[PDB]
Write a protein that binds this ligand. Structure first.
Ligand SMILES: Nc1ncnc2c1ncn2[C@@H]1O[C@H](COP(=O)(O)OP(=O)(O)OP(O)(O)=S)[C@@H](O)[C@H]1O
Ligand SMILES: Nc1ncnc2c1ncn2[C@@H]1O[C@H](COP(=O)(O)OP(=O)(O)OP(O)(O)=S)[C@@H](O)[C@H]1O
Ligand SMILES: Nc1ncnc2c1ncn2[C@@H]1O[C@H](COP(=O)(O)OP(=O)(O)OP(O)(O)=S)[C@@H](O)[C@H]1O
Ligand SMILES: Nc1ncnc2c1ncn2[C@@H]1O[C@H](COP(=O)(O)OP(=O)(O)OP(O)(O)=S)[C@@H](O)[C@H]1O
Ligand SMILES: [Mg+2]
Ligand SMILES: [Mg+2]
Ligand SMILES: [Mg+2]
Ligand SMILES: [Mg+2]
Lengths: 539, 539
């Protein structure tokens, strides 16, 4: 029952990073003496609630082999004024007496809030004592101080300094692969039916931290019990209890994960095959994003630093969002998406650029920039420009912007050193429209009588989103006939695929979302955005 | 006199959940052992004041069969600091000593306010002690901690974490059926006249929580006593005391319920019969809302996910609110209505979307969107967009918007994934007008000389609101004639039905509300909203 590294999933990188700082010095002390390293003695784990950073603490407690002392934030603050000071002092004194040792301070924000913003005098005295104790740890003393907080910005800045907590590890939101690892860990003692495919549950559990995935496994078991209890304890029933995929899907539907609104920094699942049409832009994006990462030596050879800012602009529904996700996928680079409405609803723009820096190859995408232009907006745009200037081209963070309104985009964002690579995403041509329909219909069963070539030549001027709407309306016709066919059978297989007749009905009321007059305006700005940075038509 | 489950009405599902989480593990521990799920240990009951959560606590205390300890937040906070700390500690200690046990903390917000926003130090110490005690409950110990608050957002977020009050049950505003149940519960010991129909009172008591209904019964009985005494104790008078429907209606008229301004999440009472002539829109809304819920298998089969966003637009007074209510009714889905003025009058949009998520099949309606456009407005619209983008299409929450001003609707709301299903609600045609008049006159007696076809022919270009106005004017004419006839009879039924002369009088000054020029503009915007998302007529 004792927790170990095997009970933690989704943070393989972080655990190895912790081991290198807690276990490796003790196993091989001569490595650090040989090279002259100052091994870290302050480690701060941070991340949203439920990510498993108290679990990591329990793992290090039971695996490090060094004396472990656990300080709980609320426990210290629940004591009287004098007794909270003594417990902190006794914590460090015992650690130095039993070196090597690890002091773990869970819920550091409870002990060490910002002194400027702290009201009580006793609380501020505890923060001061912790700083004194942290500074009182001699280099000889083999004492590593670990801390965990889900509010890192609420901690006193003095503690996040050299010599004090100076190494920060993010136990963040797990990705799809990590979610599967957690589910496997939490289903080891739960009977599962043969139809349970935890891979699908992991892929569908967006926004779920390990704490949420633990609840999901628990709830699915209860739903299994509910089904049996409702029908009905006989031993046959007890031996027939096995969580089925239906229970997991029921649990996933009712689940309300706590990390839905957190920014995601995972590699997207969109590939080139999801776009297809924009061949030239694919090649251009590879050179702008892929080459600096894969072939950094060649750029050093030719002596010119790559520009790491791009701007997609064009008519709505032409794949600007898909392109940003596909390129990050090809490079296997993290992807942060910040839609324009999110920016306006929000020192938080600085955090986004901080997250992008932590993700070493990262594509930082600012979608729907037209919202800022159509609009706080001045503060948001100026903050973006300052952060872009603070992002060096030598760091593998690529900034991409997308706008459906190149007519109202501030020229400061196009300045060299900023989104100066201007890529125009036009309406698809007939050949492109064929590929878009093929891409959209991959998952759908289509009858042999459907000619995508005919659809492409009928959807002249149709944006990529419009073509998706035709497919959606084609499927709805198939579902309608499927339901009607089922009623006839019950009241007295029938439609297995999406036939041509469905597409005929789908295209009856279809109209292009971008008018030819609008296309003329977009083609005008394909020639004048580069020149929309001086006086222009303002005088 | 002891309170039990029979004394609680309206919250049947919540009581079932509480039984499953409290009683069922003890009856069949082997049932949980077999499937490897550990029952929960923290339950938070939340809801507006008076909904019966203290009543639920009393019921569980008298029915669970496990040691029950009650902690009243005001009682703890009325004691000195050490006394309050000792009382909490003793509560938890006694609960652990007499397991299985339930600790109920009534008014948890009084004990555990947000520490950042708490001024005193003793309060913070109490909150920290509560957290420590919650974390000190071992898995082996069979202690379930329950808490009740009418201000869940005022509770310390740390207490709503995993391993803490991690399961929340909403004891919310009862619906008509629940109101009838509560009224029946509270009329068990009150003598009722044979003419008392509690169903009508329950239907008419909008915004009444159980406490308001208890007060309503008490006030009706007081009104009966008052009426009897005003005439006048003789035993005949005492035995003639029976609450009549007049007393209940008087009490209901004088009652001022506390939950009037709370958002309602009930299934609406509007059916298709209240609309009539919008058959194509009815079928479309069925396909959009009902099919995903009833036939998810077909959507998964054809491989394309359904869009969960709709936008009604068209001339004013044509039935956009009625359509949303009726579609919510047909699917038996919960309905939340938020009007534009409400949004502008308000971190609360997130609350609306959370409520929508809790109601599993829910139609979230944003009516009178023209108010935002005519206007805080930017913040509201950006929050709406962000929340729409956070609502996955795999969850059965459907978002509908209605606007009488398609000319000033922000294009971001029409983006694919957002309210991209644009449905146009035109002025009714002659047959639609006939159906509207038939629907509006169902409850009203009408003379056989009234020809609805003639009215429909005369009301060319009239909206549904105008036809309802015509009906209201006819009824006013009938009431006036009835009053005049009554006066004549008293000073010396004559008007049993609404004759065609009344309709002739009503139609005399009736004019259409949507001009033909406005009809032309609406018909044009029926072609250009899909295209109002790029440059458009801005350059
Ligand atoms: N990465 C993970 N791998 C496996 N189980 C996990 C993981 N993260 C969370 N869990 C489970 O969910 C529980 C969450 O508890 P904690 O680890 O204390 O969460 P946390 O990281 O401490 O977040 P806070 O800030 O303390 S609320 C754990 O006890 C595990 O049972
Ligand atoms: N080239 C394309 N290939 C395949 N699908 C496409 C393409 N362009 C657009 N789509 C579809 O249209 C949807 C929206 O496209 P996006 O990638 O968001 O382009 P966009 O520039 O963001 O336009 P909007 O304003 O967001 S609709 C995608 O999710 C696809 O379903
Ligand atoms: N669902 C219900 N069924 C029956 N009676 C109810 C119900 N809800 C309230 N009542 C009655 O109204 C009284 C007040 O309800 P309480 O449960 O005491 O208040 P509450 O739900 O705790 O709200 P707060 O937040 O404590 S003011 C109860 O004692 C009952 O007499
Ligand atoms: N198709 C209809 N069938 C029956 N009654 C209708 C119809 N359209 C409108 N009405 C009547 O008019 C009232 C107002 O209609 P709504 O449902 O509010 O339509 P609307 O789109 O909201 O227009 P407004 O601006 O709110 S009046 C309803 O309560 C009905 O009494
Ligand atoms: Mg923790
Ligand atoms: Mg997009
Ligand atoms: Mg109460
Ligand atoms: Mg309305």
């Amino acid at each position: 029952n004792e927790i170990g590294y095997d009970d933690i999933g989704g943070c393989r990188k972080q655990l190895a990073q912790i081991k290198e700082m807690v276990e490796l010095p003790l196993r091989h002390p001569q490595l650090f003496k040989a090279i002259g390293v100052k091994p870290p003695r302050g480690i701060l784990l941070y991340g949203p609630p439920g990510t498993g950073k108290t679990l990591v603490a329990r793992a290090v407690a039971n695996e490090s082999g060094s004396f472990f002392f656990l300080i709980n934030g609320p426990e210290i603050m629940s004591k009287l004024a004098g007794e909270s000071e003594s417990n902190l002092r006794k914590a460090f004194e015992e650690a130095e007496k039993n070196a090597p040792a690890i002091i773990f301070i869970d819920e550091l924000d409870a002990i060490a809030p910002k002194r400027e913003k702290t009201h009580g005098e006793v609380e501020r005295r505890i923060v001061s004592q912790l700083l004194t104790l942290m500074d009182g740890l001699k280099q000889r003393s083999h004492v590593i101080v670990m801390a965990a907080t889900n509010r890192p910005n609420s901690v006193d800045p003095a503690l996040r300094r050299f010599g004090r907590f100076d190494r920060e590890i993010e136990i963040g939101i797990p990705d799809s692969i990590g979610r599967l690892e957690i589910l496997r860990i939490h289903t080891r003692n739960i009977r599962l039916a043969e139809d349970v495919e935890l891979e699908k549950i992991a892929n569908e559990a967006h926004g779920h931290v390990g704490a949420d995935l633990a609840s999901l496994c628990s709830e699915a078991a209860l739903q299994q019990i509910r089904n049996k209890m409702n029908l009905i304890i006989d031993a046959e029933v007890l031996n027939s209890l096995a969580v089925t995929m239906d229970d997991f899907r029921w649990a996933l539907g009712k689940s309300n994960p706590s990390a839905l609104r957190e920014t995601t920094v995972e590699v997207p699942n969109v590939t080139w095959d999801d776009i297809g049409g924009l061949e030239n832009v694919k090649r251009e994006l590879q050179e702008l994003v892929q080459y600096p990462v894969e072939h950094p030596d060649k750029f050093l050879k030719f002596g010119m630093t790559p520009s790491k800012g791009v701007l997609f602009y064009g008519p709505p529904g032409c794949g600007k969002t898909l392109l940003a996700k596909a390129i990050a996928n090809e490079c296997q680079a993290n992807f942060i998406s910040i839609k324009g409405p999110e920016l306006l609803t929000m020192a938080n723009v600085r955090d986004i650029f901080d997250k992008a820096r932590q993700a070493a190859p990262c594509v930082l995408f600012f979608d729907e920039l037209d919202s800022i232009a159509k609009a706080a907006a001045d503060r948001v745009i100026n903050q973006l420009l300052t952060e872009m200037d603070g992002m060096s081209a030598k760091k593998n963070v690529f900034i991409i912007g997308a706008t459906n309104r190149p007519d109202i985009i501030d020229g400061a964002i196009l300045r060299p050193g900023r989104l100066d690579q201007l890529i125009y995403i036009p309406l698809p041509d007939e050949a492109s429209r064929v590929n878009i329909l093929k891409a959209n219909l991959r998952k759908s069963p289509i009858a042999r009588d459907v000619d995508i070539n005919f659809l492409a030549k009928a959807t002249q001027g149709f944006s990529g989103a419009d073509l998706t709407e035709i497919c959606q309306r084609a499927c709805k016709q198939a579902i309608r006939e499927s339901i009607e066919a089922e009623i006839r059978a019950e009241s007295e297989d029938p439609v297995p695929e999406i036939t041509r007749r469905h597409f005929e009905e789908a295209m009856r009321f279809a109209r292009r979302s971008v008018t030819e007059n609008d296309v003329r305006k977009y083609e005008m700005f394909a020639q004048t955005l580069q020149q929309s940075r001086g006086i222009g038509n303002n005088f």
